[PDB]
Amino acid sequence: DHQLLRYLLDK
Amino acid sequence: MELTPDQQTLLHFIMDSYNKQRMPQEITNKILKEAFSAEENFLILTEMATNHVQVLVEFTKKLPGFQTLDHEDQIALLKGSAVEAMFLRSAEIFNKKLPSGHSDLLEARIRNSGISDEYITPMFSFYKSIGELKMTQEEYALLTAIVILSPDRQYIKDREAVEKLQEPLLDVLQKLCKIHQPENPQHFACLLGRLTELRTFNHHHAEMLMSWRVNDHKFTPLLCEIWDVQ
Numbered sequence A: 001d002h003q004l005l006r007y008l009l010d011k
Numbered sequence B: 001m002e003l004t005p006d007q008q009t010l011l012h013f014i015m016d017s018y019n020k021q022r023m024p025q026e027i028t029n030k031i032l033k034e035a036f037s038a039e040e041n042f043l044i045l046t047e048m049a050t051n052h053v054q055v056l057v058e059f060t061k062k063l064p065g066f067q068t069l070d071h072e073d074q075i076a077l078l079k080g081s082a083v084e085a086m087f088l089r090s091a092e093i094f095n096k097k098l099p100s101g102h103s104d105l106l107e108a109r110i111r112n113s114g115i116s117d118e119y120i121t122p123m124f125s126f127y128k129s130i131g132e133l134k135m136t137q138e139e140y141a142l143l144t145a146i147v148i149l150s151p152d153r154q155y156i157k158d159r160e161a162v163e164k165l166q167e168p169l170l171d172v173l174q175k176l177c178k179i180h181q182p183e184n185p186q187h188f189a190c191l192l193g194r195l196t197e198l199r200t201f202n203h204h205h206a207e208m209l210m211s212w213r214v215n216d217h218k219f220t221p222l223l224c225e226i227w228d229v230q
């Protein structure tokens, strides 16, 4: 649902 | 009344992170230089907002204690505050002092950008109201941090953990309001009051964008996640 947001947060 | 050394440290740290944003002049120079079509303006908005979200995530990650929070709550805070932080940054840019006649051209260029008239009036109402507050850069930075660390956001499982992070930023902001504006003791209350008006920009944000006088409303995959469009 928010995989890009999750990625930018978990970088 | 004065800030403690720990608060001074917190303030400068928040300021350094806030300063990593695209400079207001880089934005106003482009809008003031040439008049663009509604199509070109929608593409300028989309590129501006994508850079804003990317920098906002990096600013949020630096907020003391943010990375100690539950992963799901971290997502909910970012998603819950991205649009509000965007409008707070636009309000800051709009109210920066420019040479005689430049701010009038800026408002006129924003008015004819492609957005519906219905949304123009409350947007300029908010921009003017925040401008009357005569906020410093430190006040904009802390207010953005307070907006992000709002424990009353939907889908937050541990509100107490968010509250603990927001409370020292609220204490610092209060002290700054008392120092910068000792004449106006309502200044801190006014700032917190403007946060409820920021929340109203959430409900009809998607409708604001879709009402743009353009044939195709193309959004980046990142904006689709943050704005719930397409």
Ligand SMILES: COc1ccc(-c2nc3ccccc3n2[C@H](C(=O)NC2CCCCC2)C2CCCCC2)c(OC)c1
Pocket (backbone or CB within 6 Å): B027, B031, B041, B042, B044, B045, B048, B049, B052, B086, B087, B089, B090, B091, B093, B094, B109, B110, B113, B115, B208, B209
């Ligand atoms: C949802 O509809 C709208 C309408 C207007 C704006 C807006 N208000 C502005 C006030 C001061 C300067 C710029 C402004 N902007 C756009 C822009 O570039 N916004 C950026 C978004 C990310 C953070 C930095 C600002 C402009 C408007 C003129 C045409 C090109 C886009 C806006 O920004 C929330 C959203």
